[PDB]
Amino acid sequence: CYLSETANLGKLICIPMALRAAMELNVFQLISKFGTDAKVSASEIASKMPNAKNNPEAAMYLDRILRLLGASSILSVSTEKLYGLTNSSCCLVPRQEDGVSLVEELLFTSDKVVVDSFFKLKCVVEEKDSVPFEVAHGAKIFEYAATEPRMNQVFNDGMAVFSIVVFEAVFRVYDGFLDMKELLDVGGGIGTSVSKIVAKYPLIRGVNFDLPHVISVAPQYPGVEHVAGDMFEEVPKGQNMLLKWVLHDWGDERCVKLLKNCWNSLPVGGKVLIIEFVLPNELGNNAESFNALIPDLLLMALNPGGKERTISEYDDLGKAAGFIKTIPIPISNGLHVIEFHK
Amino acid sequence: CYLSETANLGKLICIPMALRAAMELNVFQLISKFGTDAKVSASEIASKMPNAKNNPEAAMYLDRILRLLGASSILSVSTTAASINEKLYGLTNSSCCLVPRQEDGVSLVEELLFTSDKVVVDSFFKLKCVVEEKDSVPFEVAHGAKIFEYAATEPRMNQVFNDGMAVFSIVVFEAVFRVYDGFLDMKELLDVGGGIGTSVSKIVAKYPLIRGVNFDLPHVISVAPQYPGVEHVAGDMFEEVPKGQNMLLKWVLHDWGDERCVKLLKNCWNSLPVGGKVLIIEFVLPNELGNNAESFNALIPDLLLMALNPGGKERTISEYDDLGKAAGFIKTIPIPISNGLHVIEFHK
Numbered sequence: 190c191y192l193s194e195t196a197n198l199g200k201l202i203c204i205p206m207a208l209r210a211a212m213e214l215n216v217f218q219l220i221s222k223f224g225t226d227a228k229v230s231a232s233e234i235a236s237k238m239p240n241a242k243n244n245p246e247a248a249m250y251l252d253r254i255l256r257l258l259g260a261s262s263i264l265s266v267s268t269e270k271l272y273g274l275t276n277s278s279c280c281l282v283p284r285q286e287d288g289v290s291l292v293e294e295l296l297f298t299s300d301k302v303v304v305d306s307f308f309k310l311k312c313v314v315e316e317k318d319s320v321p322f323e324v325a326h327g328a329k330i331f332e333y334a335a336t337e338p339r340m341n342q343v344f345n346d347g348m349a350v351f352s353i354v355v356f357e358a359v360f361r362v363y364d365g366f367l368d369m370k371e372l373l374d375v376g377g378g379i380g381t382s383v384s385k386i387v388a389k390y391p392l393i394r395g396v397n398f399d400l401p402h403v404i405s406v407a408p409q410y411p412g413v414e415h416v417a418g419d420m421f422e423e424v425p426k427g428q429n430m431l432l433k434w435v436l437h438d439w440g441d442e443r444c445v446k447l448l449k450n451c452w453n454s455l456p457v458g459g460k461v462l463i464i465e466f467v468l469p470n471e472l473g474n475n476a477e478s479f480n481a482l483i484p485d486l487l488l489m490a491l492n493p494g495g496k497e498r499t500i501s502e503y504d505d506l507g508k509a510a511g512f513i514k515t516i517p518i519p520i521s522n523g524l525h526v527i528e529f530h531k
Numbered sequence: 532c533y534l535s536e537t538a539n540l541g542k543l544i545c546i547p548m549a550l551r552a553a554m555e556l557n558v559f560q561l562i563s564k565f566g567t568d569a570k571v572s573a574s575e576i577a578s579k580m581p582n583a584k585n586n587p588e589a590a591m592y593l594d595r596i597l598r599l600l601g602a603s604s605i606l607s608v609s610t611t612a613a614s615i616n617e618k619l620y621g622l623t624n625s626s627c628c629l630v631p632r633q634e635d636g637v638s639l640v641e642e643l644l645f646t647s648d649k650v651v652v653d654s655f656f657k658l659k660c661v662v663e664e665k666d667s668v669p670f671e672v673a674h675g676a677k678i679f680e681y682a683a684t685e686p687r688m689n690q691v692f693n694d695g696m697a698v699f700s701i702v703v704f705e706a707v708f709r710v711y712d713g714f715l716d717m718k719e720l721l722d723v724g725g726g727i728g729t730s731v732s733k734i735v736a737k738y739p740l741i742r743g744v745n746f747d748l749p750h751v752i753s754v755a756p757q758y759p760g761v762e763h764v765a766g767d768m769f770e771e772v773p774k775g776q777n778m779l780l781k782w783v784l785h786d787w788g789d790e791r792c793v794k795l796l797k798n799c800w801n802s803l804p805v806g807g808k809v810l811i812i813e814f815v816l817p818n819e820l821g822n823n824a825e826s827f828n829a830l831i832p833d834l835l836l837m838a839l840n841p842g843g844k845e846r847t848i849s850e851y852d853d854l855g856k857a858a859g860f861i862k863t864i865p866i867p868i869s870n871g872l873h874v875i876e877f878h879k
């Protein structure tokens with residue numbers, strides 16, 4: 190049965206690298222500009238690639254990429270074959286309104302800096318206190334970002350664009366921003382998250398807090414103030430705080446130190462909102478499971494102590510930091526807002 | 532449904548790199564050694580890894596790799612009454628193919644470590660270049676040399692590639708020998724681009740009257756094992772092929788474009804006697820692609836060779852016939868073996 194399983198196992202590396210090429214060639218957007226329901230040939234797609242205009246062989250090469258994605262349910266195939274979008278590939282078309290899609294976050298998670306870290310993944314099992322990213326690059330990820338402007342941009346934009354589709358889901362379910370007057374986004378990246386909160390809740394004075402190397406490249410957003418610092422040393426005073434995709438980067442002791450910094454900088458009656466994909470109690474072949482397992486594997490490779498957590502585990506961190514009423518609010522497919530009250 | 536599709540699309544880079552780590556940690560063999568239908572925890576598996584013995588956290592990290600492979604159906608996941616009143620992992624049909632056999636250590640491990648090796652993945656990072664730039668080859672963009680020239684300067688990649696081909700060759704020839712009877716009457720077989728000689732060593736073991744000759748590049752021949760009944764020959768198949776009564780081309784035509792394939796096949800024709808044949812062994816591109824092993828068995832190397840070598844591609848039966856016909860061969864005989872693998876005989 191070797192030669193049945195050669196297909197099942199040997200496709201695993203090929204599919205993501207074919208997807209990355211298709212994203213870099215803007216294939217999904219090019220299909221969409223014929224119409225979202227269009228079914229178009231490799232040569233019709235290539236005709237919209239100015240870089241391919243002197244390459245007679247472009248379409249045949251492109252067809253070889255696309256037919257693999259068609260066999261892998263990323264594109265529809267119909268009888269030169271014609272390719273169309275699927276539910277998955279519609280999420281790779283920059284929206285006509287604002288350019289948002291999953292492309293930036295998927296370009297980050299399959300970036301060479303990440304894949305080179307995954308090549309050292311076995312180190313975390315064999316060697317005490319080793320970090321695959323460190324073994325691969327000779328510095329930790331946030332130190333690396335400070336010296337590597339390309340990686341800094343890919344990572345920051347991955348987080349920022351992904352943040353937009355996350356907050357659209359949050360705002361459909363969660364109303365806890367109403368009546369806030371000030372929000373501090375702790376480890377807020379380039380400030381996109383707090384920009385979207387202020388757009389929905391125009392009375393909030395938004396403050397975005399991150400490392401110098403991130404704040405110095407952040408765009409100016411209406412109703413957002415940027416502040417640079419180090420959240421483990423101290424956090425600015427704020428009436429309310431957000432920690433999105435921060436606690437999952439760090440081990441328990443670092444999380445408790447950060448959360449105690451937050452507690453000291455909140456007023457009586459203030460809250461910190463944790464937004465994370467929560468690890469469910471039973472894992473299976475479903476979105477809730479993979480939405481947690483994907484960043485669980487990435488953080489195991491990328492940063493010391495990083496991991497995904499259950500509701501009980503987030504509650505234990507907040508209680509160790511002095512917070513007293515944990516309120517977990519499911520949003521979508523494992524994404525939660527977890528309120529910690531001071 | 533962005534937050535459904537995050538799971539479907541985001542898992543695609545994660546699964547292969549988790550699998551690679553589990554193969555490097557010999558997880559599948561370790562589970563196999565607990566016996567038939569074994570179901571073992573991460574801590575039990577880690578207990579069998581001497582490198583992990585001073586790492587209290589090793590089992591918890593290993594569990595994070597194994598649970599993703601369980602969610603992906605590469606491992607089976609279960610528990611016990613005792614533990615309800617850490618999950619346990621067992622092998623599946625796919626992961627059984629990642630356990631080195633007791634008798635000779637054969638599995639799909641070596642070929643899967645090659646196709647996910649950094650030299651391959653780095654070539655895949657430049658895949659877009661084939662579409663954009665006339666005559667660009669992703670491997671050459673990534674490494675500043677073509678793959679066979681690179682292998683002569685990089686002994687680690689040479690070993691990973693040569694062992695990936697050789698161990699896969701054993702698996703493939705076991706399938707060939709169950710179906711194909713055309714070696715039976717042969718007295719001599721020259722393996723053109725035969726790698727380190729493993730293929731022709733297995734043909735001679737099965738058919739001891741066959742005098743076996745392995746032919747490949749100098750940097751492959753220099754590391755090839757001494758095999759019973761196999762003479763090694765170094766050279767360049769595009770310049771001159773040794774005389775042989777019969778020839779094999781396995782996983783060679785698919786590395787090259789049409790003009791290079793015709794040149795090589797004309798060199799084979801000239802070195803064959805009247806009544807000689809060349810056997811082509813390839814995963815043949817089906818006339819109609821689907822969602823089946825035969826289709827993926829051709830699409831996998833099709834994508835690999837697009838990244839790794841100029842002109843390399845998988846071909847249909849008609850396209851192979853056309854190459855043989857252009858080189859002077861007659862009577863193409865396509866013989867299906869298994870899941871798209873064929874022997875195609877070209878007769879002089």
Ligand SMILES: Nc1ncnc2c1ncn2[C@@H]1O[C@H](CSCC[C@H](N)C(=O)O)[C@@H](O)[C@H]1O
Nearest residue numbers: 348352376377378399400419420421433434
């Ligand atoms: N010591 C520190 N102080 C402040 N920010 C830090 C930090 N260490 C890491 N960070 C920031 O933590 C962030 C984690 S990634 C998540 C960013 C953003 N909250 C989002 O959800 O999109 C990065 O922007 C990183 O630069």
Ligand SMILES: Nc1ncnc2c1ncn2[C@@H]1O[C@H](CSCC[C@H](N)C(=O)O)[C@@H](O)[C@H]1O
Nearest residue numbers: 696700724725726747748767768769781782
């Ligand atoms: N010019 C040339 N002359 C001889 N061998 C060549 C060559 N160019 C490439 N090769 C060889 O072609 C082989 C392709 S890989 C397949 C190897 C083997 N036939 C198998 O099926 O396992 C490699 O071993 C490679 O070194």
Ligand SMILES: COc1cc2c(cc1O)[C@@H]1Cc3ccc(OC)c(O)c3CN1CC2
Nearest residue numbers: 298434438480483484487491492537538541
């Ligand atoms: C479901 O799919 C995904 C989910 C998530 C991420 C990427 C995915 O593809 C990213 C990956 C990632 C990597 C590094 C980080 O800091 C070093 C980080 O905060 C995040 C955030 N998470 C959020 C959750």
Ligand SMILES: COc1cc2c(cc1O)[C@@H]1Cc3ccc(OC)c(O)c3CN1CC2
Nearest residue numbers: 195196199646782786828831832835839840
């Ligand atoms: C179905 O899965 C697979 C099928 C095949 C290969 C690898 C797979 O995983 C390898 C990949 C490969 C890469 C480069 C080569 O020369 C440069 C080459 O001859 C081969 C051989 N083919 C045989 C078919």
